[PDB]
Design an enzyme around this catalytic site. Structure first.
Site: not given
Length: 249
Positions: A239, A37, A145, A11, A147
């Site tokens: 996360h 990310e 990730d 993130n 999603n």
């Protein structure tokens, strides 16, 4: 011996570093670190003692993936290729100790119809790319990730999310087919039927109450990844790092 592998959606790498990511790496010393990310431009000095490959998105502060390793990288591949997924910096891979490691960040469709349709479309192209990679036959570990949560066990609030992006019927079916093409879901293999998540929202005590989703994965072919668990001792992003041992042969 085996390699310790960690996958982690940070993130924003600078945000994760401010929260203590380099300190976590100093203590835990993963042999291979797969990041999603990243957001930032490349930061090869951020984690001492790691070689790094970076695949940023075109847009500042957006998406981006990276692979870091204590052992030398080989045959770093940036992107798939695929026009839109490459522009968004979503796939990078490299060979470390004879294993092809891939860091993947699949798009969220939560913002509305436009990005959900984008996600549906590019996941078909991503499946094609993965299936070709598996046909090549070299050992592969994907840290991503995605999603997507696969089954009811994979999110606490499954009853309330069957019509929400990330748990839609066709996405669960996509994940079944993804594994059936020749990938082991290593966290699920290591958990059995136990519930463990990798993401918790920042809203309303969700992290402390363990109201979470399992949407980050370690997927493997041609090599076993064991001992895989989420690390909840730190809050470096929304996360948790997901870490296990890759049993080289």
């Amino acid at each position: 011996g085996p390699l310790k592998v960690t996958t982690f959606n940070v993130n924003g790498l600078r945000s994760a570093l401010r929260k203590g990511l380099a300190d976590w790496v100093e203590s835990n010393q993963p042999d291979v670190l797969l990041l999603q990310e990243v957001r930032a431009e490349p930061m090869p000095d951020a984690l001492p003692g790691y070689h790094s490959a970076w695949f940023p998105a075109q847009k500042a502060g957006y998406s981006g993936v990276a692979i870091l390793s204590r052992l030398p990288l080989k045959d770093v591949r940036l992107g798939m290729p695929h026009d839109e997924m490459d522009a968004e910096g979503r796939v990078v891979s490299a060979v470390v100790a004879g294993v092809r490691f891939v860091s993947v960040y699949l798009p969220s469709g939560s913002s509305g119809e436009a990005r959900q349709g984008f996600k549906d479309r590019v996941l078909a192209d991503y499946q094609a790319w993965v299936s070709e990679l598996l046909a090549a036959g070299e050992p592969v570990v994907i840290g991503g990730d995605y999603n997507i949560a696969h089954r009811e066990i994979d999110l606490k609030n499954w009853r309330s999310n069957q019509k929400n992006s990330g748990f839609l019927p066709h996405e669960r079916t996509w994940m079944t087919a993804h594994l059936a093409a020749g990938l082991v879901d290593c966290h699920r293999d290591c958990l059995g039927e136990e519930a463990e998540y990798t993401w918790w929202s920042n809203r309303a005590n969700a992290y402390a109450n363990n109201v979470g989703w399992r949407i980050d994965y370690l997927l493997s072919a041609g090599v076993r990844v064991s001992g895989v668990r989420s690390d909840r001792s730190v809050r470096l992003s929304d996360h948790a790092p997901l870490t296990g041992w890759v049993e080289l042969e």
